């Protein structure tokens, strides 16, 4: 599944709805491995629409339980991420992913 551990609390009231755009910053790394991506480096926040299957399942379920302002460590098992195939060139088969995700804003 996806485990959500809080780094800094959000407001505890404003949670994403299906169909809303979540605006986030993230850093991704392989569990006890390499950092492979960060929107912070790029100075540009990542946006995705919750519930449209644009992103991996662990993000869909993980971000849905976060409130605005929250920063959390998401640990995502391979079956909630890229599974036995991985993501070619970047994520190997059967990788556990850890993301640091900060929910900035909803649009």
């Amino acid at each position: 599944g996806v485990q959500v551990e809080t780094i800094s609390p959000g407001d505890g009231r404003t949670f994403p709805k299906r169909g809303q755009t979540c605006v986030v910053h993230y850093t991704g790394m392989l569990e006890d491995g390499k950092k492979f991506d960060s929107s912070r480096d790029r100075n540009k926040p990542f946006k995705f629409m919750l519930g449209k299957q644009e992103v991996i399942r662990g993000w869909e379920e993980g971000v849905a339980q976060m409130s605005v302002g929250q920063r959390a460590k998401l640990t995502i098992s391979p079956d909630y991420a890229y599974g036995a195939t991985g993501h070619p060139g970047i994520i190997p088969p059967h990788a556990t992913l850890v993301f640091d995700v900060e929910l900035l804003k909803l649009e």
């Binding site: 946006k47 070619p88 060139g89 970047i90």
Partner: protein
């Protein structure tokens, strides 16, 4: 057939990425992307075409150089580099 260059690229990138990442079909991904680039090559003929070419022309031309690099190298890392520039375009259009 009347369609804005914004639309033809959003739909074309979406479809080409499905063939390549979803289906592992590189031939089908080229087939989709080659006519899109060939229209940029011909040049903008409307104000809306011109402003799309001003904002995204250089990125799309660079994504095409990476794809052409891949044609000659056989190294899939060259095609990923093209998809990073295609996705930045796609997100900006979106």
């Amino acid at each position: 057939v009347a369609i804005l260059w914004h639309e033809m690229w959003h739909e074309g990138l979406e479809e080409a990425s499905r063939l390549y990442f979803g289906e592992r079909n590189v031939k089908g991904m080229f087939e989709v992307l080659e006519p899109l680039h060939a229209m940029m090559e011909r040049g903008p003929q409307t104000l809306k075409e011109t402003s799309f070419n001003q904002a995204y022309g250089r990125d799309l031309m660079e994504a095409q150089e990476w794809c052409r690099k891949y044609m000659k190298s056989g190294n899939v890392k060259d095609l990923t580099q093209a998809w990073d520039l295609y996705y930045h375009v796609f997100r900006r259009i979106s």
